[PDB]
Amino acid sequence: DLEELEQFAKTFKQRRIKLGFTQGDVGLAMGKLYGNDFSQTTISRFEALNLSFKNMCKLKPLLEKWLNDAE
């Protein structure tokens, strides 16, 4: 639900900032791992919840596993 997605996304952004994963470092890594999405754009949209649940629910676990991986 939105209530998890918001805080999760925000937290993912904080972790990303802590890693110094700017410009599109996450985007590149995800690029290699999954596919070339989250070029800053889609991350920003995620935190803004500008993907109205449908995608977001699938997006969350990919980012969670990405966080675990931290390539």
Side-chain angles (χ1 to χ4, degrees):
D1 178 81
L2 281 70
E3 295 298 301
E4 298 87 73
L5 294 168
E6 57 200 72
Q7 65 184 281
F8 174 87
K10 181 280 304 184
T11 303
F12 186 86
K13 185 173 178 176
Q14 308 324 284
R15 287 287 298 99
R16 187 175 67 95
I17 291 166
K18 182 55 58 175
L19 296 174
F21 272 28
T22 176
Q23 310 307 279
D25 194 327
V26 161
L28 185 61
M30 217 179 308
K32 295 169 178 294
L33 298 160
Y34 313 155
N36 54 260
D37 189 13
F38 301 83
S39 45
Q40 212 66 217
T41 46
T42 338
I43 287 294
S44 309
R45 290 186 63 163
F46 188 45
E47 284 82 74
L49 303 99
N50 190 51
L51 289 167
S52 312
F53 194 72
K54 58 194 181 181
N55 181 256
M56 299 183 67
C57 180
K58 313 191 185 73
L59 118 61
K60 170 163 59 181
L62 249 69
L63 300 203
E64 193 172 86
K65 178 53 57 178
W66 189 94
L67 221 181
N68 178 186
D69 162 83
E71 181 184 76

